Design a protein around this ligand. Structure first.
Ligand SMILES: *[C@@H]1O[C@H](CO)[C@@H](O)[C@H](O)[C@H]1NC(C)=O
Ligand SMILES: *[C@@H]1O[C@H](CO)[C@@H](O)[C@H](O)[C@H]1NC(C)=O
Ligand SMILES: *[C@@H]1O[C@H](CO)[C@@H](O)[C@H](O)[C@H]1NC(C)=O
Ligand SMILES: *[C@@H]1O[C@H](CO)[C@@H](O)[C@H](O)[C@H]1NC(C)=O
Ligand SMILES: *[C@@H]1O[C@H](CO)[C@@H](O)[C@H](O)[C@H]1NC(C)=O
Ligand SMILES: *[C@@H]1O[C@H](CO)[C@@H](O)[C@H](O)[C@H]1NC(C)=O
Lengths: 383, 383
C-alpha cells in the first residue's frame, strides 16, 4: 500500500495542510470525488441518495469532496485525486468538477485521462432568478442609466441573455439617474456613486460583506438552508449524518449537482442490473460493474429533471419552502431588511412592502420591467 | 431541369434582386460556393489556384461567391445555395461560410445536412496586428485611462487576449487623460470626448467613414490591394480574370480563406490520385471522386500554413510588399496622413515621423507598451 493512501492529500499553501482540514470524507463502498468550492452542499446530496436508495442496492455511495478556496490550487488538487482514486480505491467512479473550475482547467482534464465530469453551472439557476426579481420590482417613472460591473465577461454574457428572455434591454445614457448592477462579492465594497446599487454576490457571504456595502444597496442572494435534524428534510423517516448537522447548504449548488447524480444513479441501476444479481444488489454478488463509465454523458442516459422532480425523488420535499432566491436592502437605522422572495420550486415572486409613515392605502408603483423594456458596449477594466 | 437552375438565386429586399447583382460566377468544372461579406478576395484566391495547378488537373475550380451585406439575409441565402448545389451542379464541393456568419448560423447549418465549412476568422490576422502596432507606438510619460468600445463582446475577448500576449494590461482610472480604442465602422462617428481615439474598422471603409471621424483620430485598418494586371502578382506568367481587373482585395480575407483552400486542394490531389487516372488528371478519366468530403476537417489533412508559404505556393509572391496593416491619423489642415505600417509577411513594424517645425534632431519618445505594462469590468450598453 503506497504513501498517498496512508497520508491522504496534502497542500503547500508555506503551511503544510493535512488532509482532514479540507476534504469531508463520507464513508461508502463505491466512492466518488467532488472538486468544489461549496463542499457542504455536495455531502447533502450524497446523504439524500443513500437514504432514498436510488440504485436500490445494499452498498452506499461515498463522497470525498475536496474544498476549493484558491483557484490556482485547483490544478494541483486535480492531480492528487487522480493519483488517489486509481491506486487506493477498489471501486471508484470519478471526479466531479464545478463549471467555473471546469472551464478554467480544460487543458488539464484531457491530459489526465480519467473520468472527470463537469458539475453544471449554478448561474443557470441564479441569473434567471436575478432577472425575474428585477422585472417585477416596483420603481418610479424615470428611466435610468444602467452600468454593469462584473467579475468576468462570462457573467455579463449569461446575465444579458437572461435579461433578454425577460424582455429587458438595459441602456446607458448620459442621465442624472444611474443604476449599478454589480456581480461579485468584492466589487461592491464602499462604493461612492449616487445611483441605486444591485449587488449580486456570486459565492457565500461573510461578515465583511454585509458591513462593507453602501447604505440603501440591494443584495441579490440565495438563502443558505440550515441543516439541524432529519425530520425537517422529509416526513419519510431518514437520518442526517453527523458531519452535516450544523452546516448550511446552497440551493443553487444542490440542484445543479443533484441534476447530474440522478442522471448517474439511474445509469448505475441499469449497470448493476445486467452485471449483478439481486431484491437488493449485494456487492458480494456483484462482479465487473462500472465498465463503460463514460456512457452516461451520452444523451440516452442523461435526462433533464424538473426541480420538483428532484426534491420528490431524493426525499427532501420539505426543502421546497426553504429554497428561495431573495432580494435584501441594507438599511442602517445596520439591518438588511427584506424586499423580495422568489421560490425555486414554484416560481412565485413575492414582494414585501413595509407601510412606513402610517398610510391606510398604497398606490401601486409601475414595475421595473415595464419601464426598462425596448448597440455597442463600452468596457472599462478597473481595480 | 428545374426552375432554380434557370433563374438562379433571388432576394426580396421589396425589390427583386437577381442573381447577377450579388453572385460573381467564375466558370469552372468542379464548383464551389463562398458565402462572404467580401467577394472580391474570394475570387482572387480561386483565380490563383487554377493558374498554379495545386491539384495538377486540367479542370478548373469554379467559385459561386455570394455577397453578404445584411446579416439577416444570410439565413435565407444559405437555404437557396444548398437548394442550388444539390440539383443544378454535377460536381459540387461545398459552401464556405465566414466565421462571423458561421457562429451566427449554428442552428441552420446542422439542420441543412450539407458540406458547409467555416472560413477561419480574420480577427486572428488583425487583432495581433492591432496590438503590435499599439505596443511600439511613441507616447508621452503619462499613463492614461483606457475605455474600449466594441461592436460585440467577442471582439473585446479576442482583443485583450491579444493585448495580454503583447504584455499590455489596459486599466481604467479616474484620470484626466483618456484613451478610447473603438472597434467598428459605425462607432467613431463625430465623437465628442477629449481623449485620443483609436478607431479600428471591422469592414471595408467608404467615404462616409473618413469624413465622420474626429480630428486627430487614429485609424487602424489594412490596405486594400488594387488588382490591375497579372504581371504585378508574380514574375511567373499567369493571367488575371476579367471579373477581377479593377477590383481590390483584403489581405485578412485572402489569407484566412487561402489557409483553408490549400488544406482542401492538397486533399483533392490525393482524392484524384486513388480514384482517377492521369501526368495530368483528365476529368473524362475521373470517376467517383469527392466521396468522403468531410475528411479534410480531420487533422491528418488540415495543416497550418505560414503566410510566406501561402504566397509562394499560390503564385502571388509579389503581393507581400503590398500586404500591410497600417495606422493612419486624420489631420484636417482633411487628409489621413500615415503613422505606422506593419507588414504581413515579415512583421517589421515601421513608424513614420514627419519633422514638423524644422528640427535637426528628434528625441526618441518612450513607447506605449513600456508605459502601459503591468480586475473587474464595467460594461455600458449604448446606442
Ligand atoms: C493562491 O495561489 C497562488 C499561486 O500562485 C498564490 O500566489 C496565492 O497567494 C494564493 N492565494 C490567494 C488568496 O490568491
Ligand atoms: C420555474 O422556472 C423554471 C425555469 O427557471 C421552469 O422550468 C419551471 O417550470 C418553473 N416551475 C414551475 C412552473 O413550477
Ligand atoms: C404610526 O403609529 C405608531 C403607533 O402609535 C407611532 O409610533 C408612529 O409614530 C406613527 N407614525 C406617524 C407618522 O404618525
Ligand atoms: C436586413 O434584414 C432585416 C430583416 O428583418 C430588415 O429588417 C432590414 O431592413 C435589412 N437591412 C438592414 C440594413 O439592416
Ligand atoms: C509574423 O507573425 C506571425 C504571428 O502573427 C508569426 O507566425 C510569423 O512567424 C511572423 N513572420 C515572420 C517571423 O516572418
Ligand atoms: C522650415 O523651412 C521651410 C523652407 O523654407 C519653411 O517653409 C518653413 O516655414 C520653416 N519652418 C520654420 C518653423 O522655420
Amino acid at each position: 500500500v503506497p504513501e498517498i493512501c496512508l497520508n491522504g492529500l496534502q497542500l503547500t499553501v508555506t503551511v503544510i495542510r493535512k488532509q482532514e482540514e479540507f476534504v469531508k470524507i463520507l464513508e461508502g463502498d463505491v466512492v466518488l470525488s467532488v472538486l468544489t468550492k461549496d463542499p457542504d452542499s455536495a455531502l447533502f446530496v450524497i446523504n439524500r441518495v443513500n437514504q432514498a436508495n436510488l440504485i436500490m442496492a445494499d452498498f452506499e455511495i461515498g463522497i470525498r469532496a475536496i474544498s476549493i478556496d484558491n483557484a490556482s490550487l485547483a490544478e494541483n488538487l486535480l492531480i492528487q485525486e487522480v493519483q488517489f482514486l486509481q491506486q487506493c480505491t477498489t471501486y471508484s467512479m470519478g471526479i466531479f468538477v464545478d463549471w467555473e473550475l471546469y472551464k478554467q482547467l480544460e487543458s488539464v482534464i484531457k491530459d489526465l485521462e480519467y473520468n472527470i465530469w463537469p458539475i453544471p453551472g449554478t448561474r443557470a439557476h441564479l441569473f434567471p432568478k436575478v432577472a425575474h426579481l428585477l422585472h417585477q420590482m416596483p420603481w418610479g417613472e424615470k428611466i435610468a442609466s444602467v452600468e454593469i460591473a462584473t467579475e468576468t465577461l462570462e457573467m455579463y454574457n449569461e446575465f444579458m441573455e437572461a435579461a433578454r428572455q425577460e424582455h429587458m434591454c438595459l441602456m446607458h445614457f448620459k442621465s442624472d439617474d444611474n443604476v449599478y448592477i454589480m456581480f461579485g462579492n468584492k466589487l461592491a465594497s464602499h462604493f461612492k456613486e449616487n445611483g441605486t446599487l444591485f449587488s449580486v454576490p456570486t459565492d457565500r457571504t461573510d461578515d465583511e460583506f454585509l458591513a462593507d456595502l453602501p447604505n440603501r444597496a440591494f443584495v441579490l442572494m440565495e438563502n443558505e438552508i440550515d441543516l439541524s435534524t432529519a425530520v425537517e428534510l422529509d416526513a419519510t423517516p431518514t437520518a442526517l449524518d453527523e458531519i452535516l448537522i450544523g452546516k448550511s447548504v446552497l440551493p443553487s449548488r444542490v440542484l445543479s449537482f443533484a441534476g447530474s447524480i440522478i442522471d448517474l444513479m439511474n445509469w448505475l441501476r441499469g449497470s448493476l442490473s445486467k452485471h449483478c444479481k439481486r431484491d437488493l444488489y449485494v456487492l458480494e454478488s456483484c462482479f465487473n460493474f462500472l465498465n463503460f463509465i463514460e456512457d452516461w454523458r451520452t444523451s440516452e442516459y442523461r435526462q433533464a429533471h424538473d426541480t420538483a422532480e428532484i426534491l420528490s425523488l431524493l426525499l427532501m420535499r420539505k426543502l421546497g419552502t426553504a429554497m428561495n432566491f431573495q432580494m435584501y436592502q441594507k438599511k442602517v437605522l445596520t439591518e438588511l431588511r427584506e424586499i423580495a422572495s422568489q421560490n425555486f420550486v414554484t416560481n412565485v415572486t413575492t414582494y414585501y412592502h413595509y407601510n412606513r409613515d402610517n398610510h391606510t392605502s398604497l398606490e401601486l408603483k409601475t414595475k421595473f420591467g415595464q419601464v426598462f423594456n425596448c448597440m455597442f458596449w463600452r468596457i472599462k477594466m478597473d481595480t
